[PDB]
Amino acid sequence: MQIFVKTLTGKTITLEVEPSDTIENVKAKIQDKEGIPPDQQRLIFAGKQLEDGRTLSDYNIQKESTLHLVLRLRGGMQIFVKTLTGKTITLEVEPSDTIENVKAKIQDKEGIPPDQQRLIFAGKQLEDGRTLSDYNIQKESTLHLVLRL
Amino acid sequence: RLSVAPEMDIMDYCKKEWRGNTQKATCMKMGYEEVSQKFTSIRRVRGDNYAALRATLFQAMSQAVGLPPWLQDPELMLLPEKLISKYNWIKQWKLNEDLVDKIKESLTLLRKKWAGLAEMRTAEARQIACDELFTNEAEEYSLYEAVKFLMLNRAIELYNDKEKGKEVPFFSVLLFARDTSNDPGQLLRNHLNQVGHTGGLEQVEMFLLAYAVRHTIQVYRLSKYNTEEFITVYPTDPPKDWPVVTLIAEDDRHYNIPVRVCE
Protein backbone atom coordinates (compact mmCIF):
# COMPACT_ATOMS: atom_id res chain seq x y z
CA MET A 1 0.00 0.00 0.00
CA GLN A 2 0.90 3.68 -0.34
CA ILE A 3 0.48 6.44 2.25
CA PHE A 4 0.68 10.23 2.19
CA VAL A 5 2.83 12.37 4.47
CA LYS A 6 2.16 16.11 4.31
CA THR A 7 4.35 18.99 5.42
CA LEU A 8 3.03 22.27 6.81
CA THR A 9 3.25 23.83 3.34
CA GLY A 10 0.82 21.28 1.95
CA LYS A 11 3.53 19.41 0.06
CA THR A 12 2.54 15.77 -0.25
CA ILE A 13 4.99 12.88 -0.11
CA THR A 14 4.12 9.36 -1.22
CA LEU A 15 5.58 6.43 0.71
CA GLU A 16 5.69 2.74 -0.13
CA VAL A 17 4.99 0.83 3.09
CA GLU A 18 3.62 -2.26 4.80
CA PRO A 19 1.32 -1.99 7.85
CA SER A 20 4.00 -3.91 9.75
CA ASP A 21 6.46 -1.04 9.28
CA THR A 22 7.48 0.72 12.49
CA ILE A 23 7.28 4.52 12.75
CA GLU A 24 11.08 4.80 12.81
CA ASN A 25 11.05 2.84 9.53
CA VAL A 26 8.80 5.52 8.05
CA LYS A 27 11.10 8.23 9.41
CA ALA A 28 14.04 6.47 7.78
CA LYS A 29 12.15 6.31 4.48
CA ILE A 30 11.38 10.03 4.71
CA GLN A 31 15.09 10.57 5.33
CA ASP A 32 15.88 8.53 2.22
CA LYS A 33 13.46 10.56 0.09
CA GLU A 34 13.45 14.19 1.31
CA GLY A 35 16.76 14.11 3.17
CA ILE A 36 15.22 15.10 6.50
CA PRO A 37 16.99 13.73 9.62
CA PRO A 38 14.73 11.46 11.77
CA ASP A 39 15.68 13.18 15.02
CA GLN A 40 14.18 16.35 13.58
CA GLN A 41 11.16 14.38 12.42
CA ARG A 42 7.90 14.30 14.34
CA LEU A 43 5.03 12.29 12.84
CA ILE A 44 1.44 13.14 13.74
CA PHE A 45 -1.79 11.29 13.01
CA ALA A 46 -5.30 12.13 14.26
CA GLY A 47 -3.92 14.73 16.67
CA LYS A 48 -1.58 12.14 18.16
CA GLN A 49 2.22 12.04 17.97
CA LEU A 50 3.31 8.60 16.74
CA GLU A 51 5.93 6.58 18.62
CA ASP A 52 9.08 5.02 17.12
CA GLY A 53 8.35 1.59 18.58
CA ARG A 54 4.77 1.34 17.33
CA THR A 55 3.71 0.28 13.83
CA LEU A 56 1.19 1.63 11.33
CA SER A 57 -1.43 -1.06 11.97
CA ASP A 58 -1.20 -0.22 15.68
CA TYR A 59 -2.52 3.26 14.87
CA ASN A 60 -5.05 1.82 12.41
CA ILE A 61 -3.49 3.67 9.49
CA GLN A 62 -5.11 2.45 6.28
CA LYS A 63 -3.95 2.69 2.68
CA GLU A 64 -3.93 6.24 1.30
CA SER A 65 -4.06 7.65 4.83
CA THR A 66 -2.42 11.02 5.42
CA LEU A 67 0.24 11.64 8.07
CA HIS A 68 1.54 15.09 8.94
CA LEU A 69 5.22 15.94 9.39
CA VAL A 70 6.04 18.66 11.89
CA LEU A 71 9.77 19.38 12.08
CA ARG A 72 11.64 20.02 15.34
CA LEU A 73 14.06 22.38 13.54
CA ARG A 74 13.89 25.81 15.14
CA GLY A 75 16.01 28.47 13.46
CA GLY A 76 16.81 32.04 14.44
CA MET A 77 20.37 31.56 15.64
CA GLN A 78 23.86 32.24 14.30
CA ILE A 79 27.42 31.76 15.58
CA PHE A 80 30.90 32.90 14.60
CA VAL A 81 33.95 30.94 13.48
CA LYS A 82 37.17 32.92 13.69
CA THR A 83 40.03 31.94 11.37
CA LEU A 84 43.66 32.36 12.33
CA THR A 85 44.08 34.90 9.50
CA GLY A 86 41.57 37.16 11.24
CA LYS A 87 38.42 36.84 9.14
CA THR A 88 35.20 35.84 10.92
CA ILE A 89 32.64 33.56 9.28
CA THR A 90 29.01 33.93 10.34
CA LEU A 91 27.14 30.61 10.31
CA GLU A 92 23.39 30.14 10.52
CA VAL A 93 22.92 27.10 12.78
CA GLU A 94 20.58 25.18 15.09
CA PRO A 95 21.56 23.95 18.59
CA SER A 96 21.02 20.33 17.50
CA ASP A 97 23.43 20.70 14.56
CA THR A 98 26.46 18.38 14.75
CA ILE A 99 30.09 19.51 14.54
CA GLU A 100 30.19 17.39 11.39
CA ASN A 101 27.47 19.65 10.00
CA VAL A 102 29.24 22.84 11.08
CA LYS A 103 32.47 21.77 9.37
CA ALA A 104 30.45 20.76 6.31
CA LYS A 105 28.83 24.19 6.20
CA ILE A 106 32.27 25.78 6.55
CA GLN A 107 33.35 23.79 3.50
CA ASP A 108 30.21 24.92 1.68
CA LYS A 109 30.98 28.58 2.40
CA GLU A 110 34.79 28.89 2.32
CA GLY A 111 35.84 25.78 0.39
CA ILE A 112 37.96 24.48 3.27
CA PRO A 113 37.91 20.64 3.45
CA PRO A 114 36.38 19.33 6.72
CA ASP A 115 39.20 16.82 7.22
CA GLN A 116 41.58 19.77 7.60
CA GLN A 117 39.33 21.60 10.05
CA ARG A 118 39.85 21.69 13.80
CA LEU A 119 37.26 23.60 15.78
CA ILE A 120 38.22 24.85 19.22
CA PHE A 121 35.83 26.29 21.78
CA ALA A 122 36.79 27.33 25.32
CA GLY A 123 40.17 25.61 25.05
CA LYS A 124 38.52 22.35 23.97
CA GLN A 125 38.74 20.73 20.57
CA LEU A 126 35.22 19.97 19.40
CA GLU A 127 34.59 16.45 18.14
CA ASP A 128 32.44 15.28 15.25
CA GLY A 129 29.23 13.53 16.28
CA ARG A 130 28.34 15.81 19.18
CA THR A 131 26.21 18.95 19.03
CA LEU A 132 26.51 22.66 19.79
CA SER A 133 24.20 22.32 22.78
CA ASP A 134 26.28 19.39 24.03
CA TYR A 135 29.23 21.80 24.27
CA ASN A 136 26.98 24.55 25.65
CA ILE A 137 27.58 26.69 22.58
CA GLN A 138 25.10 29.54 22.82
CA LYS A 139 23.83 31.97 20.22
CA GLU A 140 26.57 34.34 19.06
CA SER A 141 29.29 32.21 20.65
CA THR A 142 32.66 32.35 18.89
CA LEU A 143 34.60 29.31 17.71
CA HIS A 144 38.22 29.20 16.63
CA LEU A 145 39.18 27.47 13.40
CA VAL A 146 42.68 26.06 13.01
CA LEU A 147 43.82 24.09 9.97
CA ARG A 148 46.21 21.19 9.40
CA LEU A 149 47.82 19.47 6.43
CA ARG B 1 24.65 49.34 16.34
CA LEU B 2 21.61 48.08 14.45
CA SER B 3 20.19 44.60 14.88
CA VAL B 4 19.17 44.95 11.24
CA ALA B 5 22.30 45.68 9.19
CA PRO B 6 22.54 48.31 6.44
CA GLU B 7 21.58 46.93 3.03
CA MET B 8 24.08 45.49 0.58
CA ASP B 9 23.59 44.14 -2.95
CA ILE B 10 22.03 40.69 -2.74
CA MET B 11 24.28 38.82 -5.17
CA ASP B 12 27.39 40.53 -3.80
CA TYR B 13 26.30 39.21 -0.42
CA CYS B 14 25.72 35.78 -1.95
CA LYS B 15 29.17 35.73 -3.54
CA LYS B 16 30.66 36.78 -0.21
CA GLU B 17 28.87 34.11 1.82
CA TRP B 18 28.91 31.10 -0.50
CA ARG B 19 32.06 30.05 -2.32
CA GLY B 20 33.50 26.62 -2.99
CA ASN B 21 31.93 23.99 -5.20
CA THR B 22 29.43 21.82 -3.36
CA GLN B 23 25.83 21.14 -4.29
CA LYS B 24 24.83 23.13 -1.20
CA ALA B 25 26.68 26.28 -2.28
CA THR B 26 25.22 25.93 -5.77
CA CYS B 27 21.69 25.57 -4.39
CA MET B 28 22.24 28.65 -2.26
CA LYS B 29 23.45 30.63 -5.28
CA MET B 30 20.50 29.59 -7.46
CA GLY B 31 18.07 30.49 -4.69
CA TYR B 32 19.72 33.85 -4.06
CA GLU B 33 19.56 34.59 -7.79
CA GLU B 34 15.88 33.73 -7.89
CA VAL B 35 15.35 36.14 -4.98
CA SER B 36 17.56 38.72 -6.69
CA GLN B 37 15.05 38.83 -9.52
CA LYS B 38 12.46 40.57 -7.31
CA PHE B 39 14.68 42.19 -4.65
CA THR B 40 17.80 44.36 -5.03
CA SER B 41 19.19 44.29 -1.51
CA ILE B 42 19.57 42.22 1.64
CA ARG B 43 19.83 43.16 5.30
CA ARG B 44 21.43 40.74 7.72
CA VAL B 45 19.32 40.23 10.80
CA ARG B 46 20.95 39.58 14.17
CA GLY B 47 21.18 35.91 15.05
CA ASP B 48 20.10 35.97 18.67
CA ASN B 49 17.16 33.60 19.13
CA TYR B 50 14.76 36.53 18.64
CA ALA B 51 15.63 36.54 14.91
CA ALA B 52 12.22 35.48 13.59
CA LEU B 53 10.44 38.09 15.66
CA ARG B 54 13.06 40.69 14.75
CA ALA B 55 12.76 40.12 11.01
CA THR B 56 8.96 39.85 10.91
CA LEU B 57 8.39 42.83 13.22
CA PHE B 58 10.98 45.05 11.55
CA GLN B 59 9.52 44.29 8.15
CA ALA B 60 5.99 44.91 9.40
CA MET B 61 6.70 48.20 11.19
CA SER B 62 9.05 49.71 8.59
CA GLN B 63 6.34 49.64 5.92
CA ALA B 64 3.42 50.44 8.24
CA VAL B 65 1.28 53.28 6.85
CA GLY B 66 -1.37 53.01 9.53
CA LEU B 67 -2.11 51.55 12.94
CA PRO B 68 -3.79 48.14 12.59
CA PRO B 69 -7.26 47.96 14.20
CA TRP B 70 -6.21 45.11 16.51
CA LEU B 71 -3.34 47.21 17.85
CA GLN B 72 -5.64 50.22 18.16
CA ASP B 73 -8.26 48.32 20.21
CA PRO B 74 -7.97 49.59 23.81
CA GLU B 75 -9.34 46.28 25.13
CA LEU B 76 -5.94 44.89 24.15
CA MET B 77 -4.33 47.08 26.80
CA LEU B 78 -6.50 45.29 29.37
CA LEU B 79 -5.46 41.87 28.04
CA PRO B 80 -2.62 41.04 30.45
CA GLU B 81 -4.69 41.57 33.62
CA LYS B 82 -7.65 39.75 32.07
CA LEU B 83 -5.58 36.81 30.86
CA ILE B 84 -3.18 36.34 33.79
CA SER B 85 -5.99 36.62 36.36
CA LYS B 86 -7.77 33.76 34.59
CA TYR B 87 -4.76 31.50 34.00
CA ASN B 88 -2.24 31.67 36.90
CA TRP B 89 0.31 29.38 35.19
CA ILE B 90 1.23 32.27 32.89
CA LYS B 91 3.21 33.64 35.86
CA GLN B 92 6.14 31.60 34.57
CA TRP B 93 7.89 33.86 32.06
CA LYS B 94 11.28 35.53 31.45
CA LEU B 95 13.03 38.86 30.81
CA ASN B 96 8.52 45.96 43.28
CA GLU B 97 7.18 44.98 39.83
CA ASP B 98 5.43 42.01 38.15
CA LEU B 99 4.56 40.26 34.89
CA VAL B 100 1.38 42.29 34.39
CA ASP B 101 3.20 45.63 34.46
CA LYS B 102 5.92 44.28 32.19
CA ILE B 103 3.56 42.92 29.52
CA LYS B 104 1.36 46.02 29.70
CA GLU B 105 4.44 48.24 29.37
CA SER B 106 5.58 46.26 26.37
CA LEU B 107 2.20 46.32 24.63
CA THR B 108 1.99 50.06 25.27
CA LEU B 109 5.45 50.51 23.75
CA LEU B 110 4.44 48.48 20.69
CA ARG B 111 1.23 50.45 20.10
CA LYS B 112 2.99 53.75 20.74
CA LYS B 113 5.83 53.12 18.33
CA TRP B 114 3.67 51.58 15.62
CA ALA B 115 1.24 54.50 15.81
CA GLY B 116 4.12 56.97 15.81
CA LEU B 117 5.60 55.50 12.64
CA ALA B 118 2.14 55.30 11.10
CA GLU B 119 1.58 59.02 11.44
CA MET B 120 4.58 60.69 9.85
CA ARG B 121 4.75 62.98 6.87
CA THR B 122 6.81 60.79 4.54
CA ALA B 123 7.56 57.10 4.02
CA GLU B 124 11.27 57.97 4.12
CA ALA B 125 10.84 59.41 7.62
CA ARG B 126 9.08 56.20 8.68
CA GLN B 127 11.87 54.00 7.33
CA ILE B 128 14.63 56.02 8.99
CA ALA B 129 12.70 56.15 12.26
CA CYS B 130 12.14 52.40 12.25
CA ASP B 131 15.88 51.98 11.65
CA GLU B 132 16.42 54.16 14.72
CA LEU B 133 14.04 51.86 16.59
CA PHE B 134 16.16 48.76 16.15
CA THR B 135 19.43 49.95 17.63
CA ASN B 136 18.75 49.75 21.33
CA GLU B 137 18.49 46.28 22.79
CA ALA B 138 16.03 47.40 25.49
CA GLU B 139 13.01 48.78 23.63
CA GLU B 140 13.50 46.09 21.00
CA TYR B 141 13.38 43.25 23.51
CA SER B 142 10.37 44.89 25.15
CA LEU B 143 8.65 44.70 21.75
CA TYR B 144 9.61 41.04 21.37
CA GLU B 145 8.16 40.29 24.80
CA ALA B 146 4.93 41.93 23.69
CA VAL B 147 4.88 39.84 20.51
CA LYS B 148 5.50 36.62 22.44
CA PHE B 149 2.59 37.52 24.71
CA LEU B 150 0.35 38.04 21.68
CA MET B 151 1.43 34.63 20.36
CA LEU B 152 0.48 33.06 23.70
CA ASN B 153 -2.93 34.73 23.78
CA ARG B 154 -3.74 33.68 20.22
CA ALA B 155 -2.60 30.14 21.05
CA ILE B 156 -4.88 30.02 24.10
CA GLU B 157 -7.77 31.24 21.96
CA LEU B 158 -7.12 28.46 19.44
CA TYR B 159 -6.93 25.78 22.13
CA ASN B 160 -10.13 26.94 23.84
CA ASP B 161 -11.85 27.22 20.45
CA LYS B 162 -10.89 23.63 19.65
CA GLU B 163 -11.97 22.23 23.01
CA LYS B 164 -15.50 23.55 22.53
CA GLY B 165 -15.49 22.29 18.95
CA LYS B 166 -15.27 25.51 16.95
CA GLU B 167 -13.57 25.62 13.54
CA VAL B 168 -9.82 26.19 13.87
CA PRO B 169 -6.85 26.50 11.51
CA PHE B 170 -5.20 23.08 11.19
CA PHE B 171 -1.79 24.33 12.33
CA SER B 172 -3.34 24.72 15.78
CA VAL B 173 -4.20 21.01 15.77
CA LEU B 174 -0.67 20.11 14.67
CA LEU B 175 0.81 22.55 17.20
CA PHE B 176 -0.84 20.99 20.25
CA ALA B 177 -0.24 17.46 18.96
CA ARG B 178 3.42 17.82 19.93
CA ASP B 179 4.26 15.89 23.13
CA THR B 180 6.01 18.98 24.51
CA SER B 181 3.25 21.37 23.34
CA ASN B 182 0.08 19.43 24.38
CA ASP B 183 -1.47 22.44 26.20
CA PRO B 184 -0.91 26.24 26.18
CA GLY B 185 0.87 25.84 29.51
CA GLN B 186 3.30 23.32 28.05
CA LEU B 187 3.66 25.59 25.04
CA LEU B 188 4.74 28.43 27.29
CA ARG B 189 7.03 26.33 29.50
CA ASN B 190 8.76 24.23 26.83
CA HIS B 191 8.80 26.61 23.84
CA LEU B 192 7.96 30.33 24.21
CA ASN B 193 10.16 30.87 27.27
CA GLN B 194 13.20 29.62 25.33
CA VAL B 195 12.44 31.98 22.46
CA GLY B 196 15.06 34.70 22.56
CA HIS B 197 17.35 32.67 24.78
CA THR B 198 18.06 28.97 24.09
CA GLY B 199 16.14 28.50 20.84
CA GLY B 200 14.23 30.02 17.94
CA LEU B 201 10.79 29.35 16.45
CA GLU B 202 9.69 26.06 14.89
CA GLN B 203 7.88 26.23 11.53
CA VAL B 204 4.55 25.44 13.20
CA GLU B 205 5.18 28.38 15.54
CA MET B 206 5.73 30.73 12.60
CA PHE B 207 2.03 30.30 11.88
CA LEU B 208 1.38 31.40 15.44
CA LEU B 209 3.60 34.47 14.96
CA ALA B 210 1.76 35.38 11.77
CA TYR B 211 -1.60 35.11 13.52
CA ALA B 212 -0.20 37.08 16.45
CA VAL B 213 0.90 40.17 14.54
CA ARG B 214 -1.72 39.52 11.84
CA HIS B 215 0.75 39.77 8.96
CA THR B 216 1.26 37.31 6.12
CA ILE B 217 4.84 36.06 6.29
CA GLN B 218 6.31 35.08 2.93
CA VAL B 219 9.61 33.21 3.20
CA TYR B 220 12.11 32.27 0.50
CA ARG B 221 13.70 29.02 1.59
CA LEU B 222 16.77 28.55 -0.56
CA SER B 223 17.35 24.92 0.44
CA LYS B 224 13.91 24.34 -1.07
CA TYR B 225 14.98 25.88 -4.38
CA ASN B 226 13.66 23.65 -7.17
CA THR B 227 10.70 22.39 -5.12
CA GLU B 228 7.18 23.73 -4.49
CA GLU B 229 8.28 24.80 -1.02
CA PHE B 230 10.77 27.39 -2.35
CA ILE B 231 8.30 30.10 -1.45
CA THR B 232 6.58 29.14 1.80
CA VAL B 233 3.74 31.21 3.25
CA TYR B 234 2.58 31.52 6.85
CA PRO B 235 -0.20 30.88 7.07
CA THR B 236 -0.95 28.78 3.98
CA ASP B 237 -4.30 30.48 3.31
CA PRO B 238 -4.01 34.04 4.74
CA PRO B 239 -6.81 36.61 5.27
CA LYS B 240 -6.93 38.96 2.28
CA ASP B 241 -6.57 42.27 4.16
CA TRP B 242 -3.40 41.23 5.99
CA PRO B 243 -0.15 42.91 4.90
CA VAL B 244 2.58 40.69 3.48
CA VAL B 245 6.17 40.70 4.73
CA THR B 246 9.03 38.81 3.09
CA LEU B 247 11.87 36.87 4.70
CA ILE B 248 14.78 34.71 3.50
CA ALA B 249 15.85 31.47 5.17
CA GLU B 250 18.85 29.69 3.65
CA ASP B 251 18.82 26.37 5.53
CA ASP B 252 15.81 27.07 7.82
CA ARG B 253 18.13 27.99 10.72
CA HIS B 254 17.79 31.79 10.43
CA TYR B 255 15.97 34.72 8.79
CA ASN B 256 17.27 37.79 6.96
CA ILE B 257 15.53 40.68 5.17
CA PRO B 258 15.25 41.14 1.36
CA VAL B 259 14.75 44.76 0.23
CA ARG B 260 13.40 46.65 -2.81
CA VAL B 261 12.49 50.23 -1.81
CA CYS B 262 15.15 51.71 0.48
CA GLU B 263 16.40 55.14 1.59
Curated annotation (Swiss-Prot), chain A:
Ubiquitin-like domain boundaries: 1-76, 77-149
Domain of life the protein comes from: Eukaryota
Residue pairs linked by disulfide bridges in the UniProt entry: none
Additional remarks: Ubiquitin is encoded by 4 different genes. UBA52 and RPS27A genes code for a single copy of ubiquitin fused to the ribosomal proteins eL40 and eS31, respectively. UBB and UBC genes code for a polyubiquitin precursor with exact head to tail repeats, the number of repeats differ between species and strains. For the sake of clarity sequence features are annotated only for the first chain, and are not repeated for each of the following chains.
Family: Belongs to the ubiquitin family.
Protein name: Polyubiquitin-C
Species annotation: Homo sapiens (Human)
Encoding gene per record: UBC
Span of the entire protein shown here: 77 to 225 of 685
From Swiss-Prot, chain B:
Region (Linear diubiquitin binding): 17-18, 46-48, 170-174, 198-204, 251-253
Reported effect, L174E: Decreased affinity for linear diubiquitin
Gene Ontology BP term (one): nucleotide-binding oligomerization domain containing 2 signaling pathway
Assigned keywords, A-Z: Acetylation, Angiogenesis, Cytoplasm, Disease variant, Hydrolase, Immunity, Innate immunity, Phosphoprotein, Protease, Thiol protease, Ubl conjugation, Ubl conjugation pathway, Wnt signaling pathway
DNA-binding among keywords: no
Effect of P169S: Severely decreased NF-kappa-B inhibition and increased NF-kappa-B signaling
Catalytic reaction annotation: Thiol-dependent hydrolysis of ester, thioester, amide, peptide and isopeptide bonds formed by the C-terminal Gly of ubiquitin (a 76-residue protein attached to proteins as an intracellular targeting signal)
Recorded domain comment: The specificity for linear polyubiquitin is given by the 'Glu-16' residue in ubiquitin chain.
Quaternary organization: Interacts (via the PUB domain) with RNF31 (via the PIM motif); the interaction is direct. Interacts with DVL2.
Family per record: Belongs to the peptidase C65 family. Otulin subfamily.
Protein name: Ubiquitin thioesterase otulin
Species assigned in the record: Homo sapiens (Human)
Range of the intact protein held here: 79 to 348 of 352
